Design a protein around this ligand. Structure first.
Ligand code: GKA
Ligand code: ZN
Length: 198
């Protein structure tokens, strides 16, 4: 009934993929209880750093990537949810279920990736475990793993970046192409598609 209708919580930044030095590594910045509490209030006072965030809802965890001052992720992870911030929940400024894409204004303190204009097909996929996986671009929205891996290793990395050799953003990881449980290829949202949405 109306009086007891619940509200969905916010997406909460719970960590990041550190790409600042020579070694990529995941960092947790918030534990499960603080995540639950922050999801309900929408108030996250933690300092944000870096380009790739680890984000969570009450039921899912995935990645989000800052490009051109927008923190982007997948609709199948975030739905229409707000994201927690120091002054309360922030409404999405982009939502496109047809592209599996959402975006919020980039958090204060984040750093943004630059959209790639290299036209290169030698890409690198960054996972939630800070693996950097070589991927050969095979089409507008597809690339093949040079070393296929069980889908277990990619689960939870939607919303992460595919990068060019120079570290520019080429796309947002959306889905895995699975044959008998092995990811041989990935699908991504091309950065051009983000730029058109903006
Ligand atoms: C609800 O509104 C929308 C709107 C648009 C939309 N667009 C979509 C393309 C879409 O896909 C669904 C989600 C997406 C997905 O799991 N992504 C991540 C990920 O990590 N998620 S996650 O864990 O972070 C999470 C779950 C918390 C958030 C990267 C993959 C990592 C590992 C793969 C695990 C096995 C799933 C294999 C799926 N692959 C296939 O279905 C392909 N078919 C075969 C046979 O292979 C293709 C892609 C069909 C060819 C697949 O990757 N999926 C299914 N859902 C939506 C929904
Ligand atoms: Zn580039």
């Amino acid at each position: 009934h109306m009086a007891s209708m619940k509200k969905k919580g916010s997406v909460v930044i719970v960590g990041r993929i550190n790409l600042s030095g020579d070694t990529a590594y995941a960092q947790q910045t918030r534990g499960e209880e603080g995540c639950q509490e922050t999801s309900q209030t929408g108030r996250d006072k933690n300092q944000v750093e870096g380009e790739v965030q680890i984000v969570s809802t009450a039921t899912q965890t995935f990645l989000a990537t800052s490009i051109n001052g927008v923190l982007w992720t997948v609709y199948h992870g975030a739905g229409t949810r707000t994201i927690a911030s120091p002054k309360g929940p922030v409404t999405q400024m982009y939502t496109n279920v047809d592209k599996d894409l959402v975006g919020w204004q980039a958090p204060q303190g984040s750093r943004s990736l630059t959209p790639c204009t290299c036209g290169s097909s030698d890409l690198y996929l960054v996972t939630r475990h800070a693996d950097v996986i070589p991927v050969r671009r095979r089409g507008d929205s597809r690339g093949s793993l040079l070393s296929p891996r069980p889908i277990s290793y990619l689960k939870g990395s939607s919303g992460g970046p595919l990068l060019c050799p120079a570290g520019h953003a080429v796309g947002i990881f959306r889905a895995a192409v699975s044959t008998r449980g092995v990811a041989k290829a990935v699908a991504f949202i091309p950065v051009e598609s983000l730029e058109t949405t903006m």
